[PDB]
């Protein structure tokens, strides 16, 4: 069992701000090799033998180490180098993959894109009643959301449900959802979404108006 | 194009078992080795271990984590791998790819290069329910970017597909992973059009439940 340690655990660098990695062992290998995962796909191949880059993998991008300490650099930050990366050895069996680092890009920050939607027709008719609501493309991650119904806001059956940086934006979106009984919903007329981030000195928010 | 396709992921009752496939394509099979690895749910990769070539006797390695449980093998007549999971538990729940692993030559720049897209598997006796799928309709048509929404409620297990019109909708798209609740999965999609588009020309959500075999479209009302 040669275990692999990564460190740091996650990390958000700036374009072209220098980074690098390691796959730390609790024994010698012969060969450091490195994977870079982005979400929703398998992993590619990105440094072999230590320090050989993969296919269609950027000059800026450099492995190296020895015996129990290795390395993954990225020269300068790149926008299109931001994944999760895994190190590690075949030197011994069992084959070990690394701790993993999770790499994020450091963009312009963009105030969420709130979103609330009310119980529709088929769902309140199925005898249901939640009510969405969307806080798209922003930047960084942290962010919180706070309903609210007729002045108090809500924490029981509050579902939420970030994703991790967009490939093609950069950015965070999350989604929470409010689900109460069909019955209950009747008993409250406006439902607000309440957003907190660090674009806004106040709680962006969005909301409607039951009605029949 | 050296092509790798993993089926046989799917919900499984605990300590029972599950075989793990994986069709091959655009290489010499019987001369190259392929391991197994896995994932779960936001950690990790786990190696689970290969299989060698012909000249290497297709002798199985394993992984101690899961050794006497889990034999690999392979049809070496139509070029397929499997994976052979015993004494299954939770922690096994996870999406499991193959990777081809050394060949019988010096293409080592290869070798753990071509991986497959992953087979998501679910260690749990949990009850099978399709979801119920609803448009997220809003209310009071501004904002140039009007964003629709579709909410995938009360399915399993995982995975869903959801994209808009018949895939034609792909950028914009925001599907959510799944929260899991009372042994129950839910997640949103949102897409954020233009009027022109909607709804005008008419916007779709088709939703699919591989598991409960549910396919279905919503057809998202203005309103
Ligand atoms: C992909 C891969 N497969 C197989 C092996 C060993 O195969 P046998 O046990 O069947 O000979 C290695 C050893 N990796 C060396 C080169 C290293 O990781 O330093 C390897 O990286």
């Known amino acids: 069992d040669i275990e692999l340690t990564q460190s740091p655990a996650i990390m958000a660098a700036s374009p072209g701000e220098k980074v690098t990695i390691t796959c730390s062992a609790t024994?010698?290998?012969?060969?450091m090799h490195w994977f870079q995962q982005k979400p929703g796909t398998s992993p590619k191949l990105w440094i072999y033998?230590?320090?050989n880059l993969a296919s269609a993998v950027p000059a800026r991008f450099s492995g190296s180490g020895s015996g129990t300490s290795y390395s993954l650099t990225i020269s300068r930050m790149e926008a299109e180098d931001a994944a999760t990366y895994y190190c590690?050895?075949?030197?011994?069996?069992?084959?070990?993959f690394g701790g993993g680092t999770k790499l994020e890009l450091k963009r312009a920050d963009a105030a969420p894109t709130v979103s609330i939607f009310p119980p529709s027709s088929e769902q309140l008719t199925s005898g249901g009643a939640s009510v969405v609501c969307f806080l798209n493309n922003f930047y960084p991650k942290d962010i919180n959301v706070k309903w609210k119904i007729d002045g108090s806001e809500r924490q029981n059956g509050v579902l939420n449900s970030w994703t991790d940086q967009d490939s093609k934006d950069s950015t965070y979106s999350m989604s929470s959802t409010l689900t109460l009984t069909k019955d209950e919903y009747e008993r409250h007329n406006s439902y607000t979404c309440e957003a907190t981030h660090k674009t806004s000195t106040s709680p962006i928010v969005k909301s409607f108006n039951r009605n029949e | 194009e050296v092509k790798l396709q993993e089926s046989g992921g799917g919900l499984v009752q605990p300590g029972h078992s599950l075989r793990l496939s994986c069709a091959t394509s655009?290489?010499?099979?019987?001369?190259?080795?392929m391991s197994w690895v896995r994932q779960p749910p936001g950690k990790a990769l786990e190696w689970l271990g290969l299989?060698?070539?012909?000249?290497?006797?297709?002798?199985?390695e394993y992984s101690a984590s899961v050794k006497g449980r889990f034999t690999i093998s392979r049809d070496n007549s139509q070029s397929i791998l499997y994976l052979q999971m015993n004494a299954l538990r939770a922690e096994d729940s996870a999406t499991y790819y193959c990777?081809?692993?050394?060949?019988?030559?010096?293409?080592?720049?290869?070798?753990?290069?071509?991986w497959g897209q992953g087979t998501t598997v679910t260690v749990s006796s949990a009850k099978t329910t399709p979801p119920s799928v609803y448009p997220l309709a809003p209310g009071s048509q501004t904002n140039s970017m009007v964003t629709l929404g579709c909410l995938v409620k009360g399915y399993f297990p995982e995975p869903v597909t959801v994209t808009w019109n018949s895939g034609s909708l792909s950028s914009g798209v925001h599907t959510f992973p799944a929260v899991l609740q009372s042994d129950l999965y839910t997640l949103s999609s949102s897409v954020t059009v233009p009027s022109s588009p909607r709804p005008s020309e008419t916007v779709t959500c088709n939703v699919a439940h591989p598991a409960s075999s549910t396919k279905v479209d919503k057809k998202i009302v203005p309103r």
């Open positions: 990777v081809r692993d050394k060949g019988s030559y010096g293409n080592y720049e290869a070798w753990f290069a071509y």
């Open positions: 655009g290489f010499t099979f019987t001369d190259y080795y």
């Open positions: 299989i060698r070539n012909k000249a290497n006797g297709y002798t199985k």
């Open positions: 024994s010698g290998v012969n060969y």
């Open positions: 033998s230590t320090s």
């Open positions: 590690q050895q075949r030197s011994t069996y069992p084959f070990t």
